[PDB]
Amino acid sequence: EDAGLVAEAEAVAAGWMLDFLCLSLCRAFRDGRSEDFRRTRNSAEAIIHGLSSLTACQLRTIYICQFLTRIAAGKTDERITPLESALMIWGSIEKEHDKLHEEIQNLIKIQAIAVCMENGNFKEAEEVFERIFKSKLLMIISQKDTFHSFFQHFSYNHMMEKIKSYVNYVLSEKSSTFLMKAAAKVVESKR
């Protein structure tokens, strides 16, 4: 038995498990299956400790998973909120800055403030605003005007809809990865 070849096979399998768990995380996010999302997130987080070197494709995969983890915790050792952390990941993923990227970016920026107002924490809403960003938005926060028409166009539902359309593209791109394809064949054979 060669120790190097065994370690290489473990790294190949970790890569397969990462894609499979990304696909499961994407579907759970799309479906709103919170408990399944939490379980898949924990498995993907543990599995990637088996990798010390990642390709460009694998880095994009883990950053998509970290991004969805923050978006899912949006209303729930960093001194920033989950939506602010999602915005940092979003702005640094190796991906095209098309119209959809910018739409998601601006929806998260406004919702990072609006989720604080929804929870009744207006001081945090101002702190979030100061870290991200103008005089019209600060007057809205100061007036506790949570249902201002600006927030109805840049809504939480609109942020989730746009992120879900992005998730469907990731989902289709990874639907043919090794582990899910082999698992679907086994299920189809029964049946």
Ligand X SMILES: COCC(=O)NCc1ccc(C)cc1
Interacting residue ranges for ligand X, rule: CB under 6 A: 41, 44-45, 48, 62, 65-66, 69
Q: How far is the CB of 19 from a copy of itself (least distance, A)?
A: 11
Using CB atoms within 10 A of its CB, is residue 29 exposed (0-12), middle (13-18) or buried (19+)?
Answer: buried
Applying CB under 8 A, which of residues 54, 73, 80, 179 lies at the interface with a copy of itself?
A: 179
Q: How far is the CB of 25 from ligand X (least distance, A)?
A: 7
Give Cα 10 distance to the centre of its chain: 26
Q: Which two tokens stand for residue 180?
A: 């899910």
Which amino acid does the sequence have at 61? T
> Under 8 Å CB-to-CB from 24, ≥6 apart: which residues?
36, 40
62 binds, among ligand X, a copy of itself, none (CB under 5 to 8 A by kind): ligand X
Tell whether residue 173 is a contact of a copy of itself (CB under 8 A): no
3 binds, among ligand X, a copy of itself, none (CB under 5 to 8 A by kind): a copy of itself
Applying CB under 8 A, which of residues 18, 20, 108, 163 lies at the interface with a copy of itself?
A: 20
Applying CB under 8 A, which of residues 13, 54, 73, 138 lies at the interface with a copy of itself?
A: 13
Q: Which two tokens stand for residue 102?
A: 């910018």
Site for a copy of itself in 31-60 (CB under 8 A): 31, 39-40, 42-43, 45-47, 49-50
Buried b (16+ CB within 10 A) or exposed e, 110-123: bbbbbbbbeeeebe
Separate counts of helices (H) and strands (E) for the chain? 10, 0
- Is 45 in contact with 18 (CB distance < 8 Å)? no
Binding site for a copy of itself (CB under 8 A): 3, 5-6, 8-10, 12-13, 16-17, 20, 24, 27, 31, 39-40, 42-43, 45-47, 49-50, 178-180, 182-184, 186-188
